[PDB]
Amino acid sequence: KGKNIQVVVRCRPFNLAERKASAHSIVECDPVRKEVSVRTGGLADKSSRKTYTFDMVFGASTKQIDVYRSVVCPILDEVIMGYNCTIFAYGQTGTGKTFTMEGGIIPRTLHQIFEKLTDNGTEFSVKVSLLEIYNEELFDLLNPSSDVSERLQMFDDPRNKRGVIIKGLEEITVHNKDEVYQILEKGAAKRTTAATLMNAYSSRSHSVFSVTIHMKETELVKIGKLNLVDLAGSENIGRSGAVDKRAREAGNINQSLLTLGRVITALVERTPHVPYRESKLTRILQDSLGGRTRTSIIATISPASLNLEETLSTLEYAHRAKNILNKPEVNQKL
Amino acid sequence: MRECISIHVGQAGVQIGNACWELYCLEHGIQPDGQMPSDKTIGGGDDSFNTFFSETGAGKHVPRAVFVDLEPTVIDEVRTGTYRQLFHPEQLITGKEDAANNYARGHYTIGKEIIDLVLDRIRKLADQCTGLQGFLVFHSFGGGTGSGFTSLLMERLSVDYGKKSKLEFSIYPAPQVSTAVVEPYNSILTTHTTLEHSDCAFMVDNEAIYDICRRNLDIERPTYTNLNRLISQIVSSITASLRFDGALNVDLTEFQTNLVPYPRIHFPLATYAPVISAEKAYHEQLSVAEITNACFEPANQMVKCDPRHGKYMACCLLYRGDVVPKDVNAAIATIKTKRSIQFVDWCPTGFKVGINYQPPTVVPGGDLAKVQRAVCMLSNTTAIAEAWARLDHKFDLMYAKRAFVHWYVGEGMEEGEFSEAREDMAALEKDYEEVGVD
Amino acid sequence: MREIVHIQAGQCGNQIGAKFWEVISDEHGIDPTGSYHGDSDLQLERINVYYNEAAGNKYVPRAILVDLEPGTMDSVRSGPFGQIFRPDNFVFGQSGAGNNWAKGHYTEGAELVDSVLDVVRKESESCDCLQGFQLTHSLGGGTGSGMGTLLISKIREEYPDRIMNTFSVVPSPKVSDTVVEPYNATLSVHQLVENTDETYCIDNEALYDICFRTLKLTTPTYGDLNHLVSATMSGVTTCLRFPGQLNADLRKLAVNMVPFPRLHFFMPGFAPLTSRGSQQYRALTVPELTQQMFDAKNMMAACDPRHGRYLTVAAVFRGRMSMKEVDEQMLNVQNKNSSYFVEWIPNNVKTAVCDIPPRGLKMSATFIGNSTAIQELFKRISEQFTAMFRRKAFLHWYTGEGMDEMEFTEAESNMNDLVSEYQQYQDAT
Numbered sequence A: 001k002g003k004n005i006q007v008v009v010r011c012r013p014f015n016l017a018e019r020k021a022s023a024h025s026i027v028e029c030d031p032v033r034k035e036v037s038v039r040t041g042g043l044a045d046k047s048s049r050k051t052y053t054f055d056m057v058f059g060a061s062t063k064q065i066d067v068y069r070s071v072v073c074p075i076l077d078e079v080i081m082g083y084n085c086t087i088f089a090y091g092q093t094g095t096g097k098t099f100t101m102e103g104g105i106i107p108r109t110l111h112q113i114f115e116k117l118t119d120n121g122t123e124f125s126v127k128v129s130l131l132e133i134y135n136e137e138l139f140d141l142l143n144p145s146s147d148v149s150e151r152l153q154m155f156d157d158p159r160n161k162r163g164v165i166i167k168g169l170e171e172i173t174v175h176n177k178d179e180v181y182q183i184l185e186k187g188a189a190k191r192t193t194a195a196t197l198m199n200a201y202s203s204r205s206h207s208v209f210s211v212t213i214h215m216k217e218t219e220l221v222k223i224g225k226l227n228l229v230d231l232a233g234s235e236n237i238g239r240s241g242a243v244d245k246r247a248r249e250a251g252n253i254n255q256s257l258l259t260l261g262r263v264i265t266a267l268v269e270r271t272p273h274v275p276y277r278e279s280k281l282t283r284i285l286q287d288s289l290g291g292r293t294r295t296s297i298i299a300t301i302s303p304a305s306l307n308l309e310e311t312l313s314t315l316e317y318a319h320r321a322k323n324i325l326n327k328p329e330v331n332q333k334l
Numbered sequence B: 001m002r003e004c005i006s007i008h009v010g011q012a013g014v015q016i017g018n019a020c021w022e023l024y025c026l027e028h029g030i031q032p033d034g035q036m037p038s039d040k041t042i043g044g045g046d047d048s049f050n051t052f053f054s055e056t057g058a059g060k061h062v063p064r065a066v067f068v069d070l071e072p073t074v075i076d077e078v079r080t081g082t083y084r085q086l087f088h089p090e091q092l093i094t095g096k097e098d099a100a101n102n103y104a105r106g107h108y109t110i111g112k113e114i115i116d117l118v119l120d121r122i123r124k125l126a127d128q129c130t131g132l133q134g135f136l137v138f139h140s141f142g143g144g145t146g147s148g149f150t151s152l153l154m155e156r157l158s159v160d161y162g163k164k165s166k167l168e169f170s171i172y173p174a175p176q177v178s179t180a181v182v183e184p185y186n187s188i189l190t191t192h193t194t195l196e197h198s199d200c201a202f203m204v205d206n207e208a209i210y211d212i213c214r215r216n217l218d219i220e221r222p223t224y225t226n227l228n229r230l231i232s233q234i235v236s237s238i239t240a241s242l243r244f245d246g247a248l249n250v251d252l253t254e255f256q257t258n259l260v261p262y263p264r265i266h267f268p269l270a271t272y273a274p275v276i277s278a279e280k281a282y283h284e285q286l287s288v289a290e291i292t293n294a295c296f297e298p299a300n301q302m303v304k305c306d307p308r309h310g311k312y313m314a315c316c317l318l319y320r321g322d323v324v325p326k327d328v329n330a331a332i333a334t335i336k337t338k339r340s341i342q343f344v345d346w347c348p349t350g351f352k353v354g355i356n357y358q359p360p361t362v363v364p365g366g367d368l369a370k371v372q373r374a375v376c377m378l379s380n381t382t383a384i385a386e387a388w389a390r391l392d393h394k395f396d397l398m399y400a401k402r403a404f405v406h407w408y409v410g411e412g413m414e415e416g417e418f419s420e421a422r423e424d425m426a427a428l429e430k431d432y433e434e435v436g437v438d
Numbered sequence C: 001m002r003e004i005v006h007i008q009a010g011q012c013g014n015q016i017g018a019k020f021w022e023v024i025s026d027e028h029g030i031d032p033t034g035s036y037h038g039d040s041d042l043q044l045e046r047i048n049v050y051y052n053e054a055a056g057n058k059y060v061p062r063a064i065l066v067d068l069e070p071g072t073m074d075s076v077r078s079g080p081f082g083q084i085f086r087p088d089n090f091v092f093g094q095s096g097a098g099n100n101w102a103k104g105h106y107t108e109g110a111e112l113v114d115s116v117l118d119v120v121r122k123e124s125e126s127c128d129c130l131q132g133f134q135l136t137h138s139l140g141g142g143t144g145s146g147m148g149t150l151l152i153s154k155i156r157e158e159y160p161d162r163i164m165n166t167f168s169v170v171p172s173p174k175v176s177d178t179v180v181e182p183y184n185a186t187l188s189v190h191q192l193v194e195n196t197d198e199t200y201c202i203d204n205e206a207l208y209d210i211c212f213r214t215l216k217l218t219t220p221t222y223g224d225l226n227h228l229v230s231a232t233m234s235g236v237t238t239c240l241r242f243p244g245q246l247n248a249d250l251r252k253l254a255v256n257m258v259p260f261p262r263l264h265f266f267m268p269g270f271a272p273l274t275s276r277g278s279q280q281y282r283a284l285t286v287p288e289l290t291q292q293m294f295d296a297k298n299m300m301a302a303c304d305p306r307h308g309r310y311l312t313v314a315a316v317f318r319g320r321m322s323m324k325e326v327d328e329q330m331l332n333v334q335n336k337n338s339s340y341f342v343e344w345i346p347n348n349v350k351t352a353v354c355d356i357p358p359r360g361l362k363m364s365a366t367f368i369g370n371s372t373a374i375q376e377l378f379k380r381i382s383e384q385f386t387a388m389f390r391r392k393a394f395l396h397w398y399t400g401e402g403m404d405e406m407e408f409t410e411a412e413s414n415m416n417d418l419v420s421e422y423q424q425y426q427d428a429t
């Protein structure tokens, strides 16, 4: 059941780096269409095109706020219902993982969350967490109080097999928006991963930011949870010419990305075994995968012809994502 | 005269080249020490001589060759061998860390370190030497080393030299059986990109050649060395023509340019005839017709192919031993009259072929008996493309499996590149078909 | 170079690893001095890389002595070629695991670190890089498991770069001395499996049965079987280290073996596989080795080869093989069963020929593949544990061990998840 997992594609305005690249926008975004078309060339020159039709499609032009509004606001209501929701950003850094996170998205969100809840008037508490997945290890950003790595182990809580429990991380509740920001600023610093040669900044680690909201009204008690996941991406080591350690780390994640593509193809498969446990990320994710959790994916792509692989890889992904059946259920609790 | 250097990639590349070199030494009669007790090389440094080695020291001949390997193993053998004494350590290099079979990783990881030395090493020789008409490449498709190495090599060599011709004698996995799982991944991925850079690429029918040679042998087994032996000898014949004028000597490359109407067709398939096993050598004295006819038969064809299926846009003939063009003509009439070989409409003419004064070259300790004449032919067929496809499919299956990705990704290689290999292959097949059609 | 550290631990491995090292040393043919008796340069260099040269050109074995109790090492030292190892090289905790994976695990670790660090430092110094490390112990028995659990994590942890294979005897499903005994193993192994890239295990029972049956001896001796096992290992080391007409690097082969590093491990196979009388009397024809390998009997572990599926099978021939021998062997495999061959990948099997035929028989081969049945069987054992769990016997001791129940549950759980893939392995051809 659940609504199908929602997938939107965003094409970045040609990155300045792209411009230095003199990358050319093969990519065409027809937001009316919600079509995105890529000059593959096929074998042929990229007269050849590959065209996809998307749940939502944003050209470079698409303004950030708009995106959010269209994607976040509906999620926020689900959180207030008790939904568990997750939004994952995939794509290129140029495409604006960074463009998206630098600005909101996070700072904007906590303000709105309190505003909607308090207008709701529900008695509520808000707790946040921020961790980074680096080379298959967990590190607490959110609480500098907590360690650089939050004490991280995960077990099954029997209620949901997919449902898991991450012992030791603490979210600290604050009724006010303000307290959250103070954490927010703190968290960010911890969050930051390694910069890259190619990009000023890169996400070495996948970042998972989670906001849990406890709501009580006269008595019905609901709990809403939102996970904002920012993909960690690798570049070809060979291209990078990065130090071996750097290459290695990139390779690990990169390889992990294949693993991620493998599980995804399984989900498409509806194959008996879904390799959630092969990554900590997909295990944590695990209950969300077409799961009860209401999930949305924002795939960012570069018009640049230069990176064939990523464009192809994204395209493949977008197909795979739909296949898995997302059963968001409002996790409304009384 | 001109000197050539051979490059060996992978265990296979070195071994095969190794066969080549020693043969050269023997054929010259230059002692494996490198300074022949025999007199100095023919005509002093003959063109053949210079390519094989240079006389310096003076009074020493040192081969022009570079041996590269990721894995220390094969190269160390060289060090062991007597030939090693001939080869000054500069020429021979070993690599600490093997391919082990990753084209991408071997290529990336190994290549970076290795290249600088090799390029320098080659460079110095290149500078010193007058130059090569071209150079030969050895490597293994299957071997990771060949795969990774070649890819790195191809771009760099191509970029730097530009004009200098490149030829690659590569081992094409027999459709019968790969070596590794990896091999299909390695081969396809490595091959396609590199090939475009390369003027032409050569692949071997391990199965076809091994079967054919072995069967020709009528021997339970050919030795791997013996198998190499065939390869070396043919090559030597090739060298001989250019090196020393035969009845007709032609610029091999220049002729080759004629031979391949298209850069699109990197190489015509080449055959050597008569197909001579030791026994085969014994059995008959080859005649112009006989050799040609023998050559035509797929049995002769090292590669397993239906020559019928492919068209012959054109073929080349090499000649060895005494020959008279009259005989050639007689063969010509025979061939021409014979329907069986199909000529592409495009090329009305068989021409051209060349003849060598000297009897065919042989690899030392050659298993096969000498043949009066040696010939090589180039043909372009769709079928040859098909063989590639044949391998491709398995690779495709692998891709379908999408298994053997994270190793590659560790190397950061994509699927897309692979897909590109496949698509390029499909490309290429289409092109081959297009050209193939008369 | 690229020496690998050899580890013997667990009492089992206290024998077994020791046996392996010693036999390997025998393989060295280096005199007990540690100088190289063997004339052969080739062996000498390869061994020599393996064994650091003491003055007097002694060979320093790459091994650590772990004692469940200190006597065990003593027996080892008192055992032959005590001299060859410098006593400095090894140290062992007196305590040992104690029969307890967890208990040993917790207790051992403190000792473990001290011992490991010194040796590891030396070893790290010793070669520029080690290919990896080999562990010998019995998981089934408490210490192999107990030590292994603690050791493996850190040891692996130290170099993610290094690739390590572990050896442990798996408890015979047929019988256990105690129910608890495999219990210690199970947690250890379960934790271990993810931890260690490669595990090599043979069921004790099958090995004993096969060994015994083949032997037609009253029983297989522990030592002898260990010797057999060590022999199995030795060939791999010897062949790889040694030149080969076709030699495959470990990193290839290993990566190759898994249809991709997700597949955690492959189960060992040995060749030639023959009965004691049969093998000893009989000489292998070229096809001969393959056939033995092919049959169920070949697998050290007991499995029905149909029941199992082979992700891949690899054999290392030692010595030269004829190319048509190559052809014959390869051909047979595909022919023999569709399912046996992996449908997906042609040339499932890889082989390398050792440049030099092994001491003794000219041709040797190894078996690679997994036994579906065996893995499944093992999981069943965990189920037995589960049943035991109903008993909840010795929960307290476990409590003393300090391991949580959840680890137990999960340990089974993960296994359960995996095991069903195991069947899948068979399902796929």
Ligand SMILES: Nc1nc2c(ncn2[C@@H]2O[C@H](COP(=O)(O)CP(=O)(O)OP(=O)(O)O)[C@@H](O)[C@H]2O)c(=O)[nH]1
Binding pocket: B009, B010, B011, B012, B013, B015, B016, B070, B071, B098, B099, B100, B101, B102, B139, B140, B141, B142, B143, B144, B145, B146, B147, B171, B173, B178, B179, B204, B206, B224, B225, B227, B228, C247, C248, C249, C252
């Ligand atoms: N032309 C020849 N090919 C050979 C010979 N022996 C093996 N081979 C083929 O070579 C291929 C294996 O390649 P290599 O041995 O060169 C391996 P390489 O060093 O490139 O990489 P790795 O060993 O994986 O590190 C495989 O297809 C074999 O069938 C030989 O004597 N001649």
Ligand SMILES: Nc1nc2c(ncn2[C@@H]2O[C@H](COP(=O)(O)CP(=O)(O)OP(=O)(O)O)[C@@H](O)[C@H]2O)c(=O)[nH]1
Binding pocket: C009, C010, C011, C012, C013, C014, C015, C016, C067, C068, C096, C097, C098, C099, C100, C104, C137, C138, C140, C141, C142, C143, C144, C145, C169, C170, C171, C172, C181, C204, C222, C223, C225, C226
């Ligand atoms: N194949 C063999 N199995 C053995 C041998 N000795 C013991 N075992 C098996 O190994 C298991 C016992 O493990 P160990 O010998 O290593 C005892 P360990 O030092 O690890 O721990 P403790 O229980 O604290 O002594 C059990 O399943 C035995 O059947 C042997 O020499 N060969």
Ligand SMILES: O=C1CCc2cc(-c3ccc(C(F)(F)F)cc3)ccc2N1
Binding pocket: A090, A091, A092, A233, A234, A235, A257, A258, A260, A261, A262, A264, A265, A310, A313, A314, A315, A316, A317, A318, A319, A320, A321
């Ligand atoms: O740097 C990057 C960008 C993201 C990416 C996605 C994939 C992918 C995404 C989705 C799928 C699948 F789910 F559709 F299978 C497969 C691969 C593979 C590699 C990369 N590398």
Ligand SMILES: [Mg+2]
Binding pocket: B010, B011, B012, B071, B099, B143, B144, B145
């Ligand atoms: Mg090799």
Ligand SMILES: [Mg+2]
Binding pocket: C010, C011, C012, C068, C069, C141, C143
């Ligand atoms: Mg013991």
